[PDB]
Amino acid sequence: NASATPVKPNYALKFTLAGHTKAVSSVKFSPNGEWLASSSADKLIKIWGAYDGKFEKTISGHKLGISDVAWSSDSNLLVSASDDKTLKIWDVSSGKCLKTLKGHSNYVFCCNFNPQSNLIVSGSFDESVRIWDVKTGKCLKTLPAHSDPVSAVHFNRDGSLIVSSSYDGLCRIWDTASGQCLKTLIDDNPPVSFVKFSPNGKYILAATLDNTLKLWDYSKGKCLKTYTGHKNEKYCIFANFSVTGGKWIVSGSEDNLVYIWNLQTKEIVQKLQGHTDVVISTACHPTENIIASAALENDKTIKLWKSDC
Numbered sequence: 001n002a003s004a005t006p007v008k009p010n011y012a013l014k015f016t017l018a019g020h021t022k023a024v025s026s027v028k029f030s031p032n033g034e035w036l037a038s039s040s041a042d043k044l045i046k047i048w049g050a051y052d053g054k055f056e057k058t059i060s061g062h063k064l065g066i067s068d069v070a071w072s073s074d075s076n077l078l079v080s081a082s083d084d085k086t087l088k089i090w091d092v093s094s095g096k097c098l099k100t101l102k103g104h105s106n107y108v109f110c111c112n113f114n115p116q117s118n119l120i121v122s123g124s125f126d127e128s129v130r131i132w133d134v135k136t137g138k139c140l141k142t143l144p145a146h147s148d149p150v151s152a153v154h155f156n157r158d159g160s161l162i163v164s165s166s167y168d169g170l171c172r173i174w175d176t177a178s179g180q181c182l183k184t185l186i187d188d189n190p191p192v193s194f195v196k197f198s199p200n201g202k203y204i205l206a207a208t209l210d211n212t213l214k215l216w217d218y219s220k221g222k223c224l225k226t227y228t229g230h231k232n233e234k235y236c237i238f239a240n241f242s243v244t245g246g247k248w249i250v251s252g253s254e255d256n257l258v259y260i261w262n263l264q265t266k267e268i269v270q271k272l273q274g275h276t277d278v279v280i281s282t283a284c285h286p287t288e289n290i291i292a293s294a295a296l297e298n299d300k301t302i303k304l305w306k307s308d309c
């Protein structure tokens with residue numbers, strides 16, 4: 001009683017990046033592919049070579065831990081989101097703080113530039129989404145987005161839309177220009193710990209704290225794919241579309257592994273072993289089949305992985 005008679009990636013460890021003194025929170029590749037930025041509970045941002053993993057510099061100034069970091073499209077600026085209730089805009093070359101973005105009334109959890117990089121979007125424990133002017137550092141809009149902390153914020157491919165997620169169990173799609181809510185994605189209502197648009201902007205990938213990732217057609221409000229087998233019941237774990245080779249979904253996990261799924265078949269195709277604590281963050285290199293992963297305080301390292309597809 002059995003059946004009658006696709007390629008997988010082969011990610012392998014290349015480098016372990018040590019230096020953070022507390023849990024890592026977020027890793028992001030620069031758009032130019034040259035750098036990896038890491039944020040940590042240790043209040044620091046570190047910059048590493050994306051290709052050889054070589055430590056470049058520490059950027060300091062936040063008064064408390066950092067949950068997230070994000071690059072401008074020209075790779076020249078970073079924004080960071082901190083428990084000190086601020087975001088900071090950094091000149092990466094000089095390491096200098098250009099602007100402190102003040103307005104959130106509690107921890108800032110998540111941040112992103114728009115592709116244009118004239119705006120920053122932030123989400124906070126204060127349950128709001130804010131849109132900031134990069135040039136002036138002024139808050140342009142406060143969206144009453146959620147009824148629990150905002151876990152993720154992301155612009156789509158042309159900057160016209162924002163997606164937000166919250167532990168309130170909702171994903172919302174916002175019109176950037178007006179700040180008006182275009183769509184709420186909702187029955188079981190598990191907390192939403194992470195969301196991002198697909199690179200093509202047609203789909204959103206949402207992580208829920210029932211050990212599940214789902215690919216939504218948000219226009220149709222229909223779930224097209226489900227990815228599971230990993231552990232996620234507590235943390236905001238960054239997930240990704242890997243598009244440089246085979247079409248994969250990449251995520252961290254509370255079982256200390258990096259999970260890679262076939263986007264179409266939803267099968268687990270790789271589990272990357274090596275981290276010694278929760279893998280809180282994954283990132284995919286913009287041009288090469290390279291993954292960065294980072295872990296919580298029993299580990300505190302970033303790992304770089306390479307695949308042939």
Ligand SMILES: Cc1cc(=O)c(C(=O)NCc2c(F)cc(-c3ccccc3)cc2F)nn1-c1cccnc1
Nearest residue numbers: 157198199200201203215224241242243247248263
């Ligand atoms: C060039 C390019 C290549 C990509 O692989 C993607 C992208 O989004 N890939 C993820 C992806 C997919 F591979 C397939 C499905 C899917 C789901 C159900 C049924 C049928 C298909 C959904 C997905 F989200 N995007 N771009 C891109 C990049 C920048 C601006 N425009 C486009």
